Structure formats: C-alpha cells, structure tokens
C-alpha cells in the first residue's frame, strides 16, 4: 500500500485517540473527587459550544446565564491571551515560546491548576481562550460547527505540537476516500448518506455522527469521523472506518470530523 504513510492522519482513531464531537477521554482528580476532561491529541477545527442564551461560549464564565465557559478575568490577565502575548509571556521558555499557535494555546492552558484545562484558539482575533467548563453537551448546551464558529479551534491538553504533520485540518478536492485492497483504492462499501447543501454542511453532519464521549463510556476516537462529500449529488456520504486511499474524482471532497469545514487543499 503506496497511502500508508500519507494515509496516517486520517487514521482518527490512532492520531487523535478521543471522542471528537465530544472528547472525554480521560479522567483526572481535583481535591479527592473524579472529573472527565478532553484529551484528544488533535485540533477541532470549527468546533464551538451552543448555548440556547443570547451569549457566546467563550465570555468568562459567570461568578450562570450571565456567562460563558471561559476563564474569568485574572489579574494579570491570563485569559483571553493573545498569540502575542503568549510568545511574550513565555519568551524564556524554549520548550514552548516557538510552539504552533495551537500547540501552544494547549500548553498555556494546560499551564493553570492533575487536570488540565481544554482551550478554544480563535483564529480572527488570534486570540487563545482557556475554557474553564470542560463540559461540552448538557444551562443546556451542545457542541457543533456553524459558520459563527469557523475560525474557533478546540483544544484539550493533549494537542501535539505535530498536529500539523500528523492531524487532519483540510478538506482534500478531487478526491475520494476509499479502501486499499489487493493493490488498487476501492470505494468504502457501505456509507450513510446524509444530503448536504454544501462541503460545510457535510462537514457538520459528519462532526454530528463523529465520535463521542458521551451518549467507561469513552469512544477513543472510534466512530463515523469521515464522509466523502459529492459535490455533484449533494450527497454526504458518512463511514465509520478509517479510510486506507484515495480516488481521484473531481465530483468529491474528502472531509472529516476534525478537518477544518471550508479550507480545501
């Protein structure tokens, strides 16, 4: 198989390890009592949290309604932090002042106090938020990708500064995901088609169906994390096994749940 190697970052479960929708992988205890908290190893592009009320996720959380699941303002101020700031604040530190924005957003937010925090980079204001609610379905709330949320990027703790090298973040034009067999890409032979106006929308209905951490209860990243997008039919086509290689076709885009949902490459 001549994919193998360019293949690996669309092995979700491996490179990310975690529910992606919602990423509760691992446990960690803050004073003699056990918490979940995100910890897949790759970005969330476009993900953000729903509030249904008038308010975004990303406001301090209140000290319910008032607020959102961020960091409350600190003194001095650690959240939000701009990527400028960061590079500043950590500018003696080798091992971190050079990091990618995101690595380093996860790093930053993972500096605060076992368990560590999950962050939302936002790439308009180039702003990184630590979210003080790790929570992330449920105040009723619920997670997703919307036009609103395009630029947000969802960080737990465990983001590798390799995400670049090894993660999903473009949706890959003219193309089709497909399974490696007996020398030649076949076509998945099952898929679950969802019709979708646009690439977006297939990418938020595959994020829908993508893992999840919650309904012990961990999906370690298994789960309906790709779709291939026919740009023709409108059809999303969604699987949930790990794609081995790809079809040149130009009526499709390949997509996955951790994939940015409008960047192609």
Same mark, same amino acid.
């Given at each position: 198989n001549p994919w193998?190697?360019?293949?690996?970052? %669309? +092995?979700?479960?491996?490179?990310?390890?975690?529910? $992606?929708?919602?990423?509760?992988?691992?446990?960690?205890?803050?004073?003699?009592?056990?918490?979940?908290?995100?910890?897949?190893?790759?970005?969330?592009?476009?993900?953000?949290?729903? $509030?249904?009320? *008038?308010?975004?996720?990303?406001?301090?959380?209140?000290?319910?309604?008032?607020?959102?699941?961020?960091?409350?303002?600190?003194?001095?101020?650690?959240?939000?932090?701009?990527?400028?700031?960061?590079? +500043?604040?950590?500018?003696?530190?080798?091992?971190?002042?050079?990091?990618?924005?995101?690595?380093?957003?996860?790093?930053?937010?993972? *500096?605060?106090?076992? %368990?560590?925090?999950?962050?939302? %980079?936002? &790439?308009?204001?180039?702003?990184?938020? $630590?979210?003080?609610?790790?929570?992330?379905?449920?105040?009723?709330?619920?997670?997703?990708?919307?036009?609103?949320?395009? *630029? %947000?990027?969802?960080?737990?703790?465990?983001?590798?500064?390799?995400?670049?090298?090894?993660?999903?973040?473009?949706?890959?034009?003219?193309?089709?995901?497909g399974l490696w067999v007996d020398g030649n890409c076949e076509d998945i032979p099952?898929?679950?088609?969802?019709?979708?106006?646009?690439?977006?929308?297939?990418?938020?209905?595959?994020?829908?169906?993508?893992?999840?951490?919650?309904?012990?209860?961990?999906?370690?990243?298994?789960? &309906?994390?790709?779709?291939?997008?026919?740009?023709?039919?409108?059809?999303?086509?969604?699987?949930?096994v790990?794609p081995t290689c790809?079809i040149?076709?130009?009526?499709?885009?390949?997509?996955?749940?951790?994939?940015?949902?409008?960047?192609?490459?």
């Amino acid at each position: 198989n001549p994919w193998t190697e360019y293949m690996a970052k %669309y +092995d979700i479960e491996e490179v990310h390890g975690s529910g $992606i929708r919602v990423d509760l992988g691992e446990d960690a205890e803050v004073a003699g009592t056990q918490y979940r908290l995100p910890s897949g190893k790759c970005p969330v592009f476009g993900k953000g949290i729903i $509030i249904e009320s *008038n308010t975004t996720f990303l406001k301090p959380v209140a000290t319910l309604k008032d607020g959102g699941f961020a960091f409350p303002p600190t003194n001095p101020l650690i959240s939000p932090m701009t990527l400028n700031g960061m590079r +500043d604040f950590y500018k003696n530190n080798e091992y971190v002042k050079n990091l990618d924005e995101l690595t380093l957003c996860s790093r930053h937010a993972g *500096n605060m106090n076992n %368990y560590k925090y999950p962050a939302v %980079y936002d &790439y308009n204001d180039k702003k990184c938020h $630590i979210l003080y609610i790790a929570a992330q379905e449920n105040f009723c709330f619920r997670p997703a990708k919307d036009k609103l949320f395009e *630029n %947000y990027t969802y960080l737990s703790k465990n983001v590798v500064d390799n995400w670049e090298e090894v993660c999903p973040r473009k949706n890959l034009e003219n193309a089709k995901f497909g399974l490696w067999v007996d020398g030649n890409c076949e076509d998945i032979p099952h898929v679950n088609e969802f019709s979708a106006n646009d690439l977006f929308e297939c990418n938020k209905l595959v994020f829908e169906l993508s893992a999840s951490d919650q309904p012990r209860y961990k999906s370690h990243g298994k789960g &309906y994390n790709w779709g291939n997008y026919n740009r023709e039919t409108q059809k999303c086509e969604i699987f949930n096994v790990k794609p081995t290689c790809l079809i040149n076709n130009s009526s499709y885009i390949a997509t996955t749940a951790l994939s940015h949902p409008i960047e192609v490459e």
